[PDB]
Write a protein that binds this ligand. Structure first.
Ligand SMILES: Cc1cc2nc3c(=O)[nH]c(=O)nc-3n(C[C@H](O)[C@H](O)[C@H](O)COP(=O)(O)OP(=O)(O)OC[C@H]3O[C@@H](n4cnc5c(N)ncnc54)[C@H](O)[C@@H]3O)c2cc1C
Ligand SMILES: NC(=O)c1ccc[n+]([C@@H]2O[C@H](COP(=O)([O-])OP(=O)(O)OC[C@H]3O[C@@H](n4cnc5c(N)ncnc54)[C@H](OP(=O)(O)O)[C@@H]3O)[C@@H](O)[C@H]2O)c1
Ligand SMILES: [Mg+2]
Length: 309
């Protein structure tokens, strides 16, 4: 049932790779495919991009690639564009199970005049649209990989991993979960609990939903999956249903799991964290506990993993 992956020597490295390529001399990779992940009612396009790096830019799950879009620095004429980082959405073996490709999950950044709604492409995001406009065979300047915060702790193969995502923040967790449930990795047999919370605008904006629902069916005792559809569901107080409200619904069992040593991960909108904090704070305090002190402990114990942007 698990998918054969190759080559097994990608397991050999003792330490994550870091900054194998830097902006001064990037790696010229090649697009394999680009597809929309969303339906017509989504507020914007998010695309899945598969990139052939030829085995020249390996990474571990949870890392990022940098992309240098073409053109010159608009601020610094006679200079290349700055790097944009993207969370890698694939396992180290990639979507072709062969160790040659990695994938990105990219939301197009588009500008709309606040009053008239007139879109203005001159104010669109350069790199996000460059990527989702890409076609098979196009060349892309890759840097990295980078990142350590979102590496998956594998010391306990029966650990609990609580994953909190908004939008493209799902990307690392797609990689985690394929490694946990889909790929045949003899040196990592996951037997714990993986719990994905995902916040997106509506049903049409769901990302990789089919893949996650399949894990629910295959591994009902090791995978849980909750969704906050902000524009189709209301929280208990009449506002938009956000991931922190879903967390609140399970506040007692999330705290027990954290108390038990669970890892908790946050990726996506930086603006979600104050509400998640608020929500975790209330639970700690009703128990008689300082959240300030508890959060400090969770970080000291290396249980708290944040990459928001
Ligand atoms: C660690 C990390 C991981 C990340 N992972 C992901 C990911 O998985 N997926 C993802 O989609 N993004 C991710 N990002 C964000 C990503 O790096 C980019 O910042 C994002 O794609 C936008 O870059 P851009 O080049 O498209 O926009 P930019 O060209 O950098 O422009 C930024 C914004 O300014 C707006 N803008 C430009 N000109 C004007 C103007 N005149 N008036 C008004 N507005 C203007 C653009 O519309 C855009 O929204 C991540 C960021 C970090 C730090
Ligand atoms: C691109 O990059 C940015 C992010 O795009 P994306 O597709 O990854 O995400 P996104 O569609 O902007 O947001 C993903 C989910 O997070 C929700 N959200 C907004 N504010 C939140 C908050 N404070 N706390 C918790 N959830 C919140 C959003 O709901 P709502 O949009 O309904 O508020 C949405 O359901 C875009 O603005 C564009 O530049
Ligand atoms: Mg869909």
């Amino acid at each position: 049932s698990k998918v054969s992956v190759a080559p097994l020597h990608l397991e050999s490295a003792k330490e994550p790779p870091l900054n194998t390529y830097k902006p001064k001399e990037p790696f010229t990779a090649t697009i394999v495919s680009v597809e929309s992940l969303v339906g017509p009612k989504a507020p914007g396009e998010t695309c899945h991009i598969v990139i052939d790096h030829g085995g020249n830019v390996p990474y571990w799950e949870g890392q990022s690639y940098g992309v240098i879009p073409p053109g010159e620095n608009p601020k610094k004429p006679g200079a290349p564009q700055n790097v944009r980082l993207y969370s890698i959405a694939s396992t180290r073996y990639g979507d072709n199970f062969d160790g040659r490709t990695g994938s990105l999950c990219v939301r197009r950044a588009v500008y709309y005049d606040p009053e008239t709604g007139k879109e203005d492409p001159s104010k669109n995001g350069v790199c996000s649209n460059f990527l989702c406009n890409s076609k098979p065979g196009d060349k892309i300047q890759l840097t990295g990989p980078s990142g350590k915060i979102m590496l998956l702790p594998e010391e306990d193969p029966n650990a609990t991993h609580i994953m909190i995502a908004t939008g493209t923040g799902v990307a690392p967790f797609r990689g985690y979960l394929r490694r946990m449930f889909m790929e045949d990795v003899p040196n990592y047999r996951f037997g714990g609990l993986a719990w994905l919370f995902l916040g997106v605008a509506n049903s049409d904006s769901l990302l990789y939903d089919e893949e996650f629902t399949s894990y629910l069916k295959q591994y009902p005792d090791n995978f849980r999956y909750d969704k906050a559809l902000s524009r189709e569901q209301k929280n208990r107080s009449g506002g938009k249903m956000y991931v922190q409200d879903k967390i609140e619904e399970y506040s007692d069992e999330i705290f027990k799991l954290l108390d038990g040593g669970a890892h908790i991960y946050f990726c996506g909108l930086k603006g979600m964290m104050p509400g998640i904090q608020d929500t975790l704070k209330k639970v700690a305090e009703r128990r008689g506990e300082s959240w300030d002190q508890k959060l400090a402990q969770l970080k000291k114990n290396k249980q708290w993993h944040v990459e928001v942007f």
